[PDB]
Nucleic acid binder design. Sequence first.
RNA 1: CUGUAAACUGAACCAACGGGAUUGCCUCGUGCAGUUCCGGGUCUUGUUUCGAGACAUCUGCCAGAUGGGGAGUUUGGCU
Length: 38
Amino acid sequence: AARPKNFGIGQDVPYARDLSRFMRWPTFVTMQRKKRVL
RNA sequence: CUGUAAACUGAACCAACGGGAUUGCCUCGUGCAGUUCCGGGUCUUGUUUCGAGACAUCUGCCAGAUGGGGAGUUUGGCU
Ligand SMILES: [Mg+2]
Ligand SMILES: [Mg+2]
């Protein structure tokens, strides 16, 4: 039937949760964002 | 009210789904076969996360002190 995984804190290995916002983008990618925000 | 918080008390392990949708199928009740989202909370004008922050450190300048750490030179004549 079900298997329930709680991807809570410390209790199970999460799935491939999208990071895409805390990742280290290549220089120009961040630099063209820090430009339109500056 | 308003906030991510489902977990060990002298050595355990946890990593690749449930459902609904979409297409035909043994069809439309039931289903076999590709597929999509859901969740395990939707967007961000948007920094990787904090912390300091127009102060700094120290970026660059000059300035004043200090500075045998170091450099260069000197360390007269008589007799
Ligand atoms: Mg660039
Ligand atoms: Mg001398």
